[PDB]
Design an enzyme around this catalytic site. Structure first.
Site, PDB file in Angstrom:
ATOM      1  N   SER A  45     -16.446  16.451  76.181  1.00 36.83           N
ATOM      2  CA  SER A  45     -16.640  17.654  76.970  1.00 36.83           C
ATOM      3  C   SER A  45     -17.505  17.545  78.224  1.00 36.83           C
ATOM      4  O   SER A  45     -17.579  18.500  78.993  1.00 36.83           O
ATOM      5  CB  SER A  45     -17.183  18.763  76.064  1.00 36.83           C
ATOM      6  N   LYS A  48     -16.024  18.552  81.588  1.00 38.28           N
ATOM      7  CA  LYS A  48     -15.833  19.937  82.004  1.00 38.28           C
ATOM      8  C   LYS A  48     -16.666  20.294  83.230  1.00 38.28           C
ATOM      9  O   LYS A  48     -16.298  21.186  84.006  1.00 38.28           O
ATOM     10  CB  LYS A  48     -16.119  20.890  80.816  1.00 38.28           C
ATOM     11  N   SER A 105     -18.351  25.215  76.107  1.00 37.73           N
ATOM     12  CA  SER A 105     -17.468  24.062  75.893  1.00 37.73           C
ATOM     13  C   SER A 105     -16.082  24.469  75.378  1.00 37.73           C
ATOM     14  O   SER A 105     -15.416  23.701  74.666  1.00 37.73           O
ATOM     15  CB  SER A 105     -18.095  23.053  74.914  1.00 37.73           C
ATOM     16  N   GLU A 141      -7.096  18.646  76.353  1.00 27.69           N
ATOM     17  CA  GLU A 141      -7.724  18.999  75.081  1.00 27.69           C
ATOM     18  C   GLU A 141      -6.519  19.268  74.177  1.00 27.69           C
ATOM     19  O   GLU A 141      -5.589  19.981  74.578  1.00 27.69           O
ATOM     20  CB  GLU A 141      -8.546  20.279  75.220  1.00 27.69           C
ATOM     21  N   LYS A 209     -24.740  19.644  79.974  1.00 30.21           N
ATOM     22  CA  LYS A 209     -23.423  19.779  79.372  1.00 30.21           C
ATOM     23  C   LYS A 209     -23.355  18.719  78.272  1.00 30.21           C
ATOM     24  O   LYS A 209     -23.519  17.525  78.527  1.00 30.21           O
ATOM     25  CB  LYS A 209     -22.293  19.547  80.383  1.00 30.21           C
ATOM     26  N   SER A 210     -23.119  19.160  77.043  1.00 26.21           N
ATOM     27  CA  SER A 210     -23.041  18.250  75.918  1.00 26.21           C
ATOM     28  C   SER A 210     -21.589  17.906  75.625  1.00 26.21           C
ATOM     29  O   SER A 210     -20.663  18.471  76.216  1.00 26.21           O
ATOM     30  CB  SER A 210     -23.640  18.917  74.677  1.00 26.21           C
ATOM     31  N   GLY A 211     -21.398  16.979  74.699  1.00 29.67           N
ATOM     32  CA  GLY A 211     -20.057  16.603  74.297  1.00 29.67           C
ATOM     33  C   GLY A 211     -20.075  16.042  72.884  1.00 29.67           C
ATOM     34  O   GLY A 211     -21.087  15.475  72.442  1.00 29.67           O
ATOM     35  N   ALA A 212     -18.977  16.249  72.164  1.00 29.60           N
ATOM     36  CA  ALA A 212     -18.812  15.720  70.815  1.00 29.60           C
ATOM     37  C   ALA A 212     -17.333  15.363  70.656  1.00 29.60           C
ATOM     38  O   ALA A 212     -16.464  16.065  71.161  1.00 29.60           O
ATOM     39  CB  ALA A 212     -19.217  16.772  69.780  1.00 29.60           C
TER      40      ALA A 212
HETATM   41  B1  LIG Z   1     -16.523  18.989  73.785  1.00 28.02           B
HETATM   42  O1  LIG Z   1     -16.778  17.559  73.504  1.00 28.02           O
HETATM   43  O2  LIG Z   1     -17.744  19.762  73.505  1.00 28.02           O
HETATM   44  C1  LIG Z   1     -15.373  19.498  72.874  1.00 28.02           C
HETATM   45  N1  LIG Z   1     -15.673  19.100  71.510  1.00 28.02           N
HETATM   46  C2  LIG Z   1     -14.938  19.514  70.494  1.00 28.02           C
HETATM   47  O3  LIG Z   1     -13.963  20.257  70.652  1.00 28.02           O
HETATM   48  C3  LIG Z   1     -15.302  19.049  69.116  1.00 28.02           C
HETATM   49  N2  LIG Z   1     -16.252  19.598  68.356  1.00 28.02           N
HETATM   50  O4  LIG Z   1     -16.781  20.729  68.903  1.00 28.02           O
HETATM   51  C4  LIG Z   1     -17.393  21.562  67.879  1.00 28.02           C
HETATM   52  C5  LIG Z   1     -16.331  22.016  66.860  1.00 28.02           C
HETATM   53  C6  LIG Z   1     -17.989  22.808  68.555  1.00 28.02           C
HETATM   54  C7  LIG Z   1     -18.544  20.802  67.160  1.00 28.02           C
HETATM   55  O5  LIG Z   1     -18.933  21.226  66.043  1.00 28.02           O
HETATM   56  O6  LIG Z   1     -19.046  19.808  67.734  1.00 28.02           O
HETATM   57  C8  LIG Z   1     -14.608  17.925  68.471  1.00 28.02           C
HETATM   58  C9  LIG Z   1     -13.431  17.382  68.942  1.00 28.02           C
HETATM   59  S1  LIG Z   1     -12.826  16.094  67.971  1.00 28.02           S
HETATM   60  C10 LIG Z   1     -14.162  16.248  66.949  1.00 28.02           C
HETATM   61  N3  LIG Z   1     -14.420  15.454  65.871  1.00 28.02           N
HETATM   62  N4  LIG Z   1     -14.950  17.222  67.336  1.00 28.02           N
END
Ligand SMILES: *[B]([O])([O])[C][N]C(=O)/C(=N\OC([C])([C])C([O])=O)C1=[C]SC([N])=N1
Ligand SMILES: [K+]
Ligand SMILES: [K+]
Ligand SMILES: [K+]
Ligand SMILES: [K+]
Ligand SMILES: [K+]
Length: 263
Positions: A45, A48, A105, A141, A209-212
């Protein structure tokens, strides 16, 4: 300061996965400290912010309007769209979409914005055109969060992302009004509490801006500094860890606490 690298390398050790880091002077652009600065990591993310940067560039050139309204439908929705899922009936403006993409996000908001500029290919062309020959967005996405090992799709490097953020927030790339709008959205970030923000002293400024993503991917890009003004840029990425989301947040928070202590 080297003591922060102790924490960064300790993080890589504790997470059993690579950690990339870079602390950059916002004004001079000087790299103050780094770790795996030129290795690739999934952007997740954090892209973004670059997406809305491209949108604001189109706005400045008179190719887009922040007040333009986009209508979408239930089938447009993808996983994790906390804001867009609430506006199916009357849509959202481009401005409202960037706010959702950056502050919450929101994934569908990101896809709708990507569509307005021509897709990933055009975001990547926009980046290359502003001097970032490394960062690339290739998918939409949700697929861009796959984080396949050794895959260069949808990746950046800590150094490239830091330099790009620096140009976006302080260079002539965007008008003053637009660059302020970009940092205003990052400052209002609402989903990065457990990260650098949990280590920010009272009175300090932060726009982030964070990302996961999959395979333990986690990260954050930020401009922060004392007395309500940003003065340094920080970029932290990690991928490959099997650690829980809390353990990953804590490591980033502890790296934050260290860079603040040795500011
Ligand atoms: B961006 O990297 O912030 C978008 N990230 C995501 O959509 C994912 N998790 O976001 C939430 C559900 C809010 C979280 O709890 O971190 C994501 C995409 S694939 C994955 N394992 N997690
Ligand atoms: K230093
Ligand atoms: K150094
Ligand atoms: K609709
Ligand atoms: K609605
Ligand atoms: K997972």
């Amino acid at each position: 300061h080297p003591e922060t690298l102790v924490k960064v390398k300790d993080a890589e050790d504790q997470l059993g996965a690579r950690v990339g880091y870079i602390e950059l002077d916002l004004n001079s652009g000087k790299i103050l400290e780094s770790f795996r600065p030129e290795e690739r990591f999934p952007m997740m993310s954090t892209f973004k912010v670059l997406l809305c940067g491209a949108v604001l560039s189109r706005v400045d050139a008179g190719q887009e309007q922040l007040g333009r309204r986009i209508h979408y439908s239930q089938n447009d929705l993808v996983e994790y769209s906390p804001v867009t899922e609430k506006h199916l009936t009357d849509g959202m403006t481009v401005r409202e979409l960037c706010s959702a993409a950056i502050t919450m996000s929101d994934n569908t908001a990101a896809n709708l914005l990507l569509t307005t500029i021509g897709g990933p290919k055009e975001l990547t062309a926009f980046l290359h055109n502003m001097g970032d020959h490394v960062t690339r967005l290739d998918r939409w996405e949700p697929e861009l969060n796959e984080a396949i090992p050794n895959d260069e799709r949808d990746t950046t490097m800590p150094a490239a992302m830091a330099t790009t953020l620096r140009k976006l927030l302080t260079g002539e790339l965007l008008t003053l009004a637009s660059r302020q709008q970009l940092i205003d959205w990052m400052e209002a970030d609402k989903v990065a509490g457990p990260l650098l923000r949990s280590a920010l002293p009272a009175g300090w400024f932060i726009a982030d801006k964070s990302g996961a993503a999959e395979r333990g991917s986690r990260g954050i890009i930020a401009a922060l500094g004392p007395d309500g003004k940003p003065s340094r840029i920080v970029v932290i990425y990690t991928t490959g860890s099997q650690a829980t989301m809390d353990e990953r947040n804590r490591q980033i928070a502890e790296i934050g606490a260290s860079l603040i202590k040795h500011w």
